[PDB]
């Protein structure tokens, strides 16, 4: 169930997984999925030639980046409080 290429699809599948994990308040795993997804979407952006597609992917990338930031700020804060 893995092949090379298809960056957009891989990225979207991972963020879909992150959002479910996020919804379930499983933030450590959620964050991992968000950043895996974001790495692929960045590749998707790099090789997207349709300007409208690029704008839309980029807009979503920003939204996910924003969510991922929130989760990391939460996770590391939590780890510090655990000490």
């Amino acid at each position: 169930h893995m092949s090379t290429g298809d960056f957009l699809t891989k990225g979207i599948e991972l963020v879909q997984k992150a959002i479910d994990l996020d919804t379930a308040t499983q933030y450590e795993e959620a964050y991992t999925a968000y950043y895996n997804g974001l790495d692929y979407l960045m590749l998707a952006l790099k090789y997207e030639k349709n300007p409208k597609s690029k704008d839309l992917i980029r807009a979503k990338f920003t939204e996910y980046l924003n969510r991922a930031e929130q989760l990391k700020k939460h996770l590391e804060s939590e780890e510090a409080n655990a000490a």
Binding site: L8, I19, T23, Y27, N66, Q70, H74
Partner: peptide, 26 residues
């Protein structure tokens, strides 16, 4: 049709806008 596929995938990308804000403090 690769073009229509690509366009559809982008169109249907998921949203985070339903997720609850996650505050950080002390």
């Amino acid at each position: 049709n690769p073009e229509k596929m690509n366009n559809a995938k982008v169109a249907n990308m998921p949203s985070t806008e339903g997720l609850p804000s996650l505050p950080q403090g002390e």
